């Protein structure tokens, strides 16, 4: 499980 | 010795067009997102686009005082990123500078965070629209 | 004329302490997670928050950050004179487009 924080980034991994 | 350089900034009339590049490296090129960006004297810093990587589908976001006039494109085998410029306006005047997307991770006690930041910045390179 | 906006100028003697605003709406600050950067001239900006209030390796306790509604504050302790720097907010826009954007920068003088 990854979480991505910025812009234009897929939240969910 | 990460670093990001950029040239073909200039004197350019307005209605003309201009191609500036960015040369990477120190780093896996290919692996990162990167950003234009630009700052007018005496203003403050604003984004031009972002190119994404390769393995994220290569897509181009625009700022809307640019989309339609500039266009982004990299190329990894050369560590290159480009921006062409078109109609360039007087209020396009500016440093240019490019930058990398960078993260710091926390692994969390289950799962990983990603915090992303612009990271490596160029020292820019001056385009001046004016007659 | 900036997305965000922070006062142009702060200062403080060394041993003090300093806060820096940075003023956004709902869909920069409000929505997103903010950022800090220093920089001195000539040089590239260095990340010194992320997350509203997580400071990389490297950044001394003497920064932190905080975020309320669609402002966020970056406060600065026990003032080095080597702090003497520009200081500017960054996140990203809700939009279309996922802008990053930017405060216009505060100069902290260390008076001396």
């Known amino acids: 499980k990854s979480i991505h924080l910025g812009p234009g980034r897929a939240f969910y991994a | 010795e990460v670093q990001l350089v950029e040239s073909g900034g200039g004197l350019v009339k307005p209605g003309g067009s201009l191609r500036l590049t960015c040369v990477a490296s120190g780093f896996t090129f290919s692996d990162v997102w990167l950003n234009w960006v630009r700052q007018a004297p005496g203003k403050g810093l604003e984004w031009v686009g972002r190119i994404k990587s390769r393995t994220d589908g290569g897509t181009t976001d625009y700022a809307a005082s640019v989309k339609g006039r500039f266009t982004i494109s990299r190329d990894d085998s050369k560590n290159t990123l480009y921006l062409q410029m078109n109609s360039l306006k007087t209020e396009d005047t500016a440093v240019y500078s490019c930058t990398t997307d960078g993260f710091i991770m926390i692994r969390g006690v289950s799962e990983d965070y990603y915090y992303y930041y612009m990271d490596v910045w160029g020292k820019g390179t001056t385009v001046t629209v004016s007659s | 004329q900036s997305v965000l906006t922070q006062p142009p100028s702060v200062s403080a003697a060394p041993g003090q302490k300093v806060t820096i605003s940075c003023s956004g709406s709902?869909?920069?600050?409000?929505?997103?997670?903010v950022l800090w950067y220093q920089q001195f001239p000539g040089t590239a900006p260095k990340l010194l928050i992320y997350g509203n209030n997580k400071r990389p390796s490297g950044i001394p306790d003497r920064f932190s950050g905080s975020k309320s509604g669609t402002s966020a504050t970056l406060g600065i302790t026990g003032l080095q004179t080597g702090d003497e720097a520009d200081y500017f907010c960054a996140t990203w826009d809700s939009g279309l487009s996922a802008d990053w954007v930017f405060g216009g920068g505060t100069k902290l003088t260390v008076l001396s």
């Open positions: 709902s869909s920069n600050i409000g929505n997103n997670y």
